Amino acid sequence: DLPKSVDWRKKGYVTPVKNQKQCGSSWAFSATGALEGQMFRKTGKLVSLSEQNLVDCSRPQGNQGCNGGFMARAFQYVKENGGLDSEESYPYVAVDEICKYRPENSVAQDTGFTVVAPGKEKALMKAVATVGPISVAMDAGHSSFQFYKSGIYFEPDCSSKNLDHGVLVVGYGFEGSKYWLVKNSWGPEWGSNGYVKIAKDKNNHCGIATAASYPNV
């Protein structure tokens, strides 16, 4: 029986909330989050990873930097590239740049990635319980999401198929009402200190279980 609640922030798996600002790099933040957790699991050291490295360097794997991308192609870039620079060595400037990856500054690697069984919240729950924080895509397109502040986000027009935003499931739980605990990349001033509770086990709300993946380290 899987636990009734998981919060990987309590185990030291999760960096503070970051801000993608004016760049369509949510895919890159979702990917660094999942890789930060898997590297922590392997090493015991939490190290902030470069979204800018992903934005600048993962075009050959079919990402388009601030114009959009996919967590899986980010994980594929790190695999093919043999590394990924730290946030500190390769800081975030929120614009498209020419690749300036340095292998000397690599602090992370992966061998590939695992896709969670599409559209299966019970699969996502197993993955979150057993692996750590999971990269997911959601429909964040509704003004209700922008002004989210507390409680369980539910949005009746939310698509489980048209997904526009990469985020990170860092756990799950229930209010005294089941939710996914989601880390966003819109700074800590948005939502609940940068976090949102998304309705869990309500027919894959906002597509949270549609495109879930994590890197293999």
């Binding site: 949510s26 388009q64 959009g68 495109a211």
Partner: protein
């Protein structure tokens, strides 16, 4: 594609994109030295508006206006073919 610009056809004559076009073009020219064909929106930490514009004293120019979650606007870019 995920987090991509979404083209917004036939929105070109909406007052909102006319004000944004004017805001964009006037911001750019005011901070230059000396002297709507397409609308696209992108969900970021806020919203980007990428407006393709026909400008004349003729040029095809692309500009991006960023509006952050506090509703503060800025012109991210402005250039012409």
């Amino acid at each position: 594609l995920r987090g991509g610009y979404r083209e917004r056809p036939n929105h070109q004559e909406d007052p909102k994109y006319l004000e944004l076009a004017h805001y964009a073009t006037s911001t750019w020219s005011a901070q230059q030295p000396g002297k709507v064909l397409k609308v696209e929106t992108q969900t970021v930490a806020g919203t980007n508006y990428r407006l393709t514009l026909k400008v004349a004293e003729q040029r095809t120019c692309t500009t991006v206006i960023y509006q952050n979650l506090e509703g503060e606007k800025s012109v991210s870019s402005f250039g012409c073919a």
